[PDB]
Ligand binder design. Structure first.
Ligand SMILES: Nc1nc2c(ncn2[C@@H]2O[C@H](COP(=O)(O)OP(=O)(O)OP(=O)(O)O)[C@@H](O)[C@H]2O)c(=O)[nH]1
Ligand SMILES: [Mg+2]
Lengths: 49, 428
């Protein structure tokens, strides 16, 4: 059987395949206390001589 | 932000684009493939893994002169449909360029200019380069102004002409293509810089001391003109000037928008290191009435405005001293409705050195885009050729054959006649 000998809980308990990858997730620029995170920045301007 | 689109038309347009886009490539560090080993935004883009595509359209009805950039090293630099070509050349015929065979290539030119404008976040100008002495540069180039002035109305359209020289033509129907193409550069052009080949020949003869220069050497100096023109759009300086301020502090009443160029740290390495090329000496050679890039003497005309673009290790105290000594000389004169007539602009970037070309290493530069009433003689010399040819109806069967009525010859001469009449009227 697949049930336990005294607790009658499924011991095999399986692992159905995730149909998608459920991937590429989230995480946001937001970091906990609602500001912005520190990614590297840019300059987008004329050359700073 | 800070983008400008250059629009080359005519065979001289491709060759002047081969030197100008070359100089823009070095002046931001782009290798011949298109990869740097954001000052570049006016001229190039960013296409992922370091690719840098120029913002240009090379437009010609004859494939031969646009094929040499398609088969040389720079097929891989330019995007391969930014080099729009055709089948038959307009063949020194303003009628062919503007009415007959330019009206099938004009679709691909406007479609590509639109695509080159959709990736812009604030576009300053259209630096159109052409040569009004021939076919597709006089024809299709004119029609491209008609289409550009109606879809991009607020947009400013700078235009570097290559107006016919007095005694050197390399074309005999050239007076027809010059006079008939004034209206594109009078009502659909906001800045009309007038250049000619002889004045570059003279500068190359006495300053660079190349006795026997080629068109590729003529494209050297005109490349230096646009680098100093768009200097403030790309690198920082004490005083900056953008193309909105070239067409404001220089251009008087709107029909008068015809300016002349004079770069003048022109020197080569045998002379260069012997003299001080400081601010005073380079600006006296700039105002010298033999270094004009027009074959047009300013000593019989009145300076309405001047735009000095000092470019290098130039201190502003020396700029204000240099504008004083050019203002105290009687041989240089100004119109009475001009108490202030200079828009000085300094770029901190040194002039880009020329390995293997013709110039030398100079620490500072100067270029003038000055509007004067002396420019009322570059069209009077071409009046005499037009009236002499059209008196006997010479060469006009080639024009009328593709659908160019005989009427337009008369009011193109009349339009230039009102252009002349407008120029001595300002100088009263
Ligand atoms: N600055 C400069 N001018 C050039 C160059 N090549 C030709 N020209 C000038 O262009 C003028 C005539 O125009 P074309 O060379 O015929 O070019 P285009 O406008 O395409 O005319 P077509 O080829 O007949 O359609 C001549 O007076 C030449 O002096 C060049 O490489 N640099
Ligand atoms: Mg041509």
């Amino acid at each position: 059987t697949s049930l336990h000998m005294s607790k009658l809980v499924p011991v095999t308990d399986l692992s159905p395949r995730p149909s998608f990858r459920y991937h590429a997730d989230t995480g946001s620029l937001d970091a906990t206390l609602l500001p912005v995170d520190a990614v590297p920045q840019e300059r987008i301007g004329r050359r700073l001589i | 932000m800070r983008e400008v689109i250059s629009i080359h038309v005519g065979q001289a347009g491709i060759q002047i684009g081969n030197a100008c886009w070359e100089l823009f490539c070095l002046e931001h560090g782009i290798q011949p493939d298109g990869q740097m080993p954001d000052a570049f935004n006016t001229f190039f883009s960013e296409t992922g893994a370091g690719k840098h595509v120029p913002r240009c359209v090379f437009l010609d009805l004859e494939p031969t002169v646009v094929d040499e950039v398609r088969t040389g090293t720079y097929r891989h630099l330019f995007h391969p449909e930014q080099l729009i070509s055709g089948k038959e050349d307009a063949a020194n015929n303003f009628a062919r360029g503007h009415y007959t065979i330019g009206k099938e290539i004009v679709d691909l030119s406007l479609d590509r200019i639109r695509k080159l404008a959709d990736n812009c976040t604030g576009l300053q100008g259209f630096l159109m380069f052409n040569a009004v002495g021939g076919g597709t540069g006089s024809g299709l180039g004119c029609l491209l102004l008609e289409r550009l002035s109606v879809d991009y109305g607020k947009k400013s359209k700078l235009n570097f002409c290559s107006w016919p020289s007095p005694q050197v033509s390399t074309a005999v129907v050239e007076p027809y293509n010059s006079v008939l193409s004034t209206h594109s550069l009078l009502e659909h052009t906001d800045v009309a810089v007038m250049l000619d080949n002889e004045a570059i020949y003279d500068i190359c003869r006495r300053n660079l001391d190349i006795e026997r220069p080629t068109y590729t050497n003529l494209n050297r100096l005109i490349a230096q003109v646009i680098s100093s023109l768009t200097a403030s759009l790309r690198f920082d300086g004490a005083l900056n000037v953008d193309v909105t301020e070239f067409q404001t502090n220089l251009v008087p009443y709107p029909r008068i928008h015809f300016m002349l160029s004079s770069y003048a740290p022109i020197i080569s390495a045998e002379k260069a290191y012997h003299e001080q090329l400081s601010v005073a000496e380079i600006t006296n050679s700039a105002f010298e009435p033999a270094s004009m890039m027009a074959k047009c003497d300013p000593r019989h005309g009145k300076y309405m405005a001047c735009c000095l673009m000092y470019r290098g290790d130039v201190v502003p105290k020396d700029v204000n001293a240099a504008v004083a000594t050019i203002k105290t000389k009687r041989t240089i004169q100004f119109v009475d409705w001009c108490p202030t007539g200079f828009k000085c602009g300094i770029n901190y970037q040194p002039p880009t050195v020329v390995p293997g070309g013709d110039l030398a290493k100079v620490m500072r530069a100067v270029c003038m885009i000055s509007n004067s009433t002396a420019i009322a003689e570059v069209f009077s010399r071409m009046d005499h050729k037009f009236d002499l040819m059209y008196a006997k109806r010479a060469f006009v069967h080639w024009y009328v054959g593709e659908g160019m009525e005989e009427g337009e010859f008369s009011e193109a001469r009349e339009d230039l006649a009102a252009l002349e009449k407008d120029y001595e009227e300002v100088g009263i």
